Amino acid sequence: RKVAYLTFDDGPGKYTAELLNTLKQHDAKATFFLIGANVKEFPDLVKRENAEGHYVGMHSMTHNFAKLYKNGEYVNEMKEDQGLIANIIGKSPKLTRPPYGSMPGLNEGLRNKVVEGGFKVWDWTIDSLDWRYNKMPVDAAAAQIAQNVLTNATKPQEVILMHDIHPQSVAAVPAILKGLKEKGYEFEAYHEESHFPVNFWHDNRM
Amino acid sequence: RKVAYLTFDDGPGKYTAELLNTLKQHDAKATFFLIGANVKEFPDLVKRENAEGHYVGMHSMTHNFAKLYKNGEYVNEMKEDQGLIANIIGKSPKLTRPPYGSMPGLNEGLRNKVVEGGFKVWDWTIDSLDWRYNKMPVDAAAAQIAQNVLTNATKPQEVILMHDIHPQSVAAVPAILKGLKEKGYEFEAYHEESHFPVNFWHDNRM
Amino acid sequence: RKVAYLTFDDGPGKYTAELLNTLKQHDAKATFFLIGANVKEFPDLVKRENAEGHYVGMHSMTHNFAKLYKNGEYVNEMKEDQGLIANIIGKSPKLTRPPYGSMPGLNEGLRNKVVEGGFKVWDWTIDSLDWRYNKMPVDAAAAQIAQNVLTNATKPQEVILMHDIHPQSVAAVPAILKGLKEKGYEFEAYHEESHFPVNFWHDNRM
Amino acid sequence: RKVAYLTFDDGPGKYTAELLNTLKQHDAKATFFLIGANVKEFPDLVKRENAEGHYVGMHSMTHNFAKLYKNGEYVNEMKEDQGLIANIIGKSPKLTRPPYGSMPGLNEGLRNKVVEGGFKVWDWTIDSLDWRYNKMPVDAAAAQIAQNVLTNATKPQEVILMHDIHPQSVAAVPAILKGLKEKGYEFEAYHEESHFPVNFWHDNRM
Ligand SMILES: NCCCC[C@H](N)C(=O)NO
Ligand SMILES: NCCCC[C@H](N)C(=O)NO
Numbered sequence: 013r014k015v016a017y018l019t020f021d022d023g024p025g026k027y028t029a030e031l032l033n034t035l036k037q038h039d040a041k042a043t044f045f046l047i048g049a050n051v052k053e054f055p056d057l058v059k060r061e062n063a064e065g066h067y068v069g070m071h072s073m074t075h076n077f078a079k080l081y082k083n084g085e086y087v088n089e090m091k092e093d094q095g096l097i098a099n100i101i102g103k104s105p106k107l108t109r110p111p112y113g114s115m116p117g118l119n120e121g122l123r124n125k126v127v128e129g130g131f132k133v134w135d136w137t138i139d140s141l142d143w144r145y146n147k148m149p150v151d152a153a154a155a156q157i158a159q160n161v162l163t164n165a166t167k168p169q170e171v172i173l174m175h176d177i178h179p180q181s182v183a184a185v186p187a188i189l190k191g192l193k194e195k196g197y198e199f200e201a202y203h204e205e206s207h208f209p210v211n212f213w214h215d216n217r218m
Numbered sequence: 219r220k221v222a223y224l225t226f227d228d229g230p231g232k233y234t235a236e237l238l239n240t241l242k243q244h245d246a247k248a249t250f251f252l253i254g255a256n257v258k259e260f261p262d263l264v265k266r267e268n269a270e271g272h273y274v275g276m277h278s279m280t281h282n283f284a285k286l287y288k289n290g291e292y293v294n295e296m297k298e299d300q301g302l303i304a305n306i307i308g309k310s311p312k313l314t315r316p317p318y319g320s321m322p323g324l325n326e327g328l329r330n331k332v333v334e335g336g337f338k339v340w341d342w343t344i345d346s347l348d349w350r351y352n353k354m355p356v357d358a359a360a361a362q363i364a365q366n367v368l369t370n371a372t373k374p375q376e377v378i379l380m381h382d383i384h385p386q387s388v389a390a391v392p393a394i395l396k397g398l399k400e401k402g403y404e405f406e407a408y409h410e411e412s413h414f415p416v417n418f419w420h421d422n423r424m
Numbered sequence: 425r426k427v428a429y430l431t432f433d434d435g436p437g438k439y440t441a442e443l444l445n446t447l448k449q450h451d452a453k454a455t456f457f458l459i460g461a462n463v464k465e466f467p468d469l470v471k472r473e474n475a476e477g478h479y480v481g482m483h484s485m486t487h488n489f490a491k492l493y494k495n496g497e498y499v500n501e502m503k504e505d506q507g508l509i510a511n512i513i514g515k516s517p518k519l520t521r522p523p524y525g526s527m528p529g530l531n532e533g534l535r536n537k538v539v540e541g542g543f544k545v546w547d548w549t550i551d552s553l554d555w556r557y558n559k560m561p562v563d564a565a566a567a568q569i570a571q572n573v574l575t576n577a578t579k580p581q582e583v584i585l586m587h588d589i590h591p592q593s594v595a596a597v598p599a600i601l602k603g604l605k606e607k608g609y610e611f612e613a614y615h616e617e618s619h620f621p622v623n624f625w626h627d628n629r630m
Numbered sequence: 631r632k633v634a635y636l637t638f639d640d641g642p643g644k645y646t647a648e649l650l651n652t653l654k655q656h657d658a659k660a661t662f663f664l665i666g667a668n669v670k671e672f673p674d675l676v677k678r679e680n681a682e683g684h685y686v687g688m689h690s691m692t693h694n695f696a697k698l699y700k701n702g703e704y705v706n707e708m709k710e711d712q713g714l715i716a717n718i719i720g721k722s723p724k725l726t727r728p729p730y731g732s733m734p735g736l737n738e739g740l741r742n743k744v745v746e747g748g749f750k751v752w753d754w755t756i757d758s759l760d761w762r763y764n765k766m767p768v769d770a771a772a773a774q775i776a777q778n779v780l781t782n783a784t785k786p787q788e789v790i791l792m793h794d795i796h797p798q799s800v801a802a803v804p805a806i807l808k809g810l811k812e813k814g815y816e817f818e819a820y821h822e823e824s825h826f827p828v829n830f831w832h833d834n835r836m
């Protein structure tokens with residue numbers, strides 16, 4: 013069967029509640045990788061995301077490339093983010109989504125620490141390219157983003173990269189949600205017990 | 219709708235003519251990001267690149283991370299470079315390719331200065347890793363470099379990072395051209411009028 | 425009669441146990457040259473290497489070129505490393521593998537002292553270059569590293585240089601083990617009584 | 631048809647005349663790559679080799695790995711050696727044979743200088759392994775060396791690596807001369823107008 017994993021990064025943000033409504037209204041479950049600072053200021057949205065059956069994973073504290081990878085703080089930031097999230101939803105998530113992807117940032121050393129810290133790493137198989145259409149008219153932008161993901165949806169499993177801190181991104185989702193549904197896809201959240209590898213390194217320990 | 223953008227960096231140099239010839243035989247256009255000192259040493263090579271339908275953009279004067287980013291010479295160096303190139307081909311190009319990529323060197327300040335200067339910044343979506351294959355037979359280095367490229371071309375647009383200043387890179391170009399062409403790609407040069415953002419910062423102003 | 429001597433340097437490490445299993449699974453014997461710091465921290469892995477029919481040789485304490493060769497600490501470091509290994513496996517190995525190879529580091533003075541100390545020296549006849557392949561997907565890297573080795577196996581004896589301290593390296597070994605066996609090689613460990621010279625200096629006293 | 635290019639390195643030496651006799655009486659042509667100091671001390675042998683129709687190439691001045699490749703003195707030494715030989719045989723030879731082979735020593739920069747200085751570079755396709763049997767009974771040693779090349783001779787063109795500064799090598803030559811002669815090989819010397827590439831880098835400019 014075809015399963016589609018919508019993933020949303022850099023949240024929560026001010027369009028997240030509209031997204032959570034749009035998703036719920038189509039009974040569609042998704043995954044959110046949250047930044048620590050946005051977890052601090054939107055505890056409600058965090059609690060709601062988990063409450064409406066979506067997976068709530070980490071996307072670090074600083075979203076800073078040099079700190080995470082060059083200064084080796086990745087796993088440390090993923091753990092601190094994990095704590096903040098656990099304080100709200102009462103579970104300690106294991107799935108991380110690397111800021112800027114894992115390639116080339118997540119070197120062999122840091123990949124051991126992730127494995128040793130108990131974390132998984134997910135990248136994506138489709139880039140919605142939503143960041144291109146920023147600060148542009150929302151509906152035109154969103155329609156293009158929609159077509160971006162739909163025409164690249166070909167494989168039995170797909171992990172789609174989006175950003176709910178962008179209006180054109182959240183606006184893109186309704187057209188994506190059932191356009192993908194007719195191609196036979198279903199919209200699941202990530203489940204830890206059903207982990208399968210999706211990382212640029214093809215590193216199957218994560 | 220598929221378009222491959224071969225880009226070659228740190229040229230011109232002693233293999234560039236052989237590469238320019240390979241490009242010509244295949245009627246393939248591409249893009250060159252030049253270092254200022256090589257602009258001055260091989261001024262006729264520059265002419266010919268632009269004369270055969272390739273884009274000529276800048277890749278700095280010093281290629282020195284500390285000077286470019288920590289000290290913020292970037293926009294200066296790309297301007298100086300631009301001037302040299304203009305004096306030879308007439309055009310003042312706008313596109314720049316950052317040494318060592320934009321991430322994390324081009325901070326928001328420099329990025330502001332870039333867009334303020336009218337300049338533009340390209341990174342890449344495929345890294346051929348061509349320059350690292352320098353301690354094996356050239357023909358075998360070229361085959362692994364071609365394979366790297368051919369097996370990552372998937373998106374409707376691909377910006378392929380290469381260097382025309384290593385023999386194994388230029389030797390890879392024939393295999394790469396034939397392979398991608400099998401995959402339905404066209405080999406156009408960058409066009410100024412037809413710009414779309416391609417950078418690690420996801421900053422669509424540049 | 426064709427024999428392939430897989431040698432693994434700078435271990436033991438965190439992929440070593442998995443390497444030991446893959447070896448064991450193909451009924452294959454190999455050689456390990458160990459650094460002093462890792463013999464101390466992975467003593468079990470050392471005993472297992474020996475216990476499972478592999479040769480356990482030295483690869484110094486510091487892996488530092490200036491201390492080993494410029495300051496002449498080579499024989500000292502190999503002796504200290506020898507002591508550490510013997511406290512674990514109960515025999516004092518004589519074969520050493522020079523960090524960075526013997527050329528040009530092991531000058532005649534040090535080569536004389538090596539000879540006067542009872543030590544043997546092995547360089548290699550095939551460089552897998554496996555450690556250089558740390559910036560691509562691990563399976564892709566392993567396949568190219570396999571290719572490197574398979575295409576250079578031409579002589580009845582081949583001493584292949586690898587590193588069991590990198591993920592892409594241990595992943596390459598299955599394809600190497602299957603290609604070379606198909607090319608007719610057998611995978612033996614170094615035996616001290618059967619010593620034959622393999623060094624860049626063509627010095628057959630080592 | 632089959633042609634065998636016997637090449638002898640590091641000479642001339644004290645068995646060179648005995649080899650030149652062994653060659654002449656078997657109506658056999660060869661190639662000698664000479665060290666500058668041995669050219670200085672054996673002008674007769676140098677003159678004789680050319681006078682008797684063999685090719686006389688360079689093998690550098692110091693035979694020092696670090697000087698040649700790391701300090702980039704390779705081409706300088708081949709030119710200084712070229713001068714010495716030209717003063718004897720009245721022509722300036724173009725073919726050089728890299729001490730310790732060209733891999734990895736002859737990097738891309740140096741391969742350009744060799745190309746720009748007008749030099750060619752030959753490695754070999756067969757290593758006689760003659761250095762292993764040094765200071766050993768000449769008779770046994772020579773027989774093994776003879777077969778070493780014989781068991782590795784399969785291709786229409788073969789460049790055998792030998793050393794006429796060793797007794798066991800020169801003694802091996804008679805037996806080699808008859809194994810190859812039976813396989814249909816002919817023993818021609820290298821001649822410059824018929825140059826074809828034989829180098830570990832597969833750099834076909836050399
Ligand atoms: N607005 C996008 C900035 C960062 C994009 C990058 N792909 C990432 O870290 N997504 O979570
Ligand atoms: N190993 C240093 C990186 C150099 C390559 C870099 N990607 C670049 O600027 N190419 O043009």
Ligand SMILES: NCCCC[C@H](N)C(=O)NO
Nearest residue numbers: 433434483522523524525
């Ligand atoms: N310059 C890289 C050093 C690694 C290769 C070297 N031959 C070695 O020490 N192996 O153990």
Ligand SMILES: NCCCC[C@H](N)C(=O)NO
Nearest residue numbers: 626639640728729730761
């Ligand atoms: N007696 C062997 C010393 C040098 C061997 C090496 N293969 C070489 O440079 N031959 O010319």
Ligand SMILES: [Zn+2]
Nearest residue numbers: 021022111112
């Ligand atoms: Zn992000």
Ligand SMILES: [Zn+2]
Nearest residue numbers: 227228317318
């Ligand atoms: Zn560059």
Ligand SMILES: [Zn+2]
Nearest residue numbers: 433434523524
């Ligand atoms: Zn080592």
Ligand SMILES: [Zn+2]
Nearest residue numbers: 639640729730
């Ligand atoms: Zn030599």
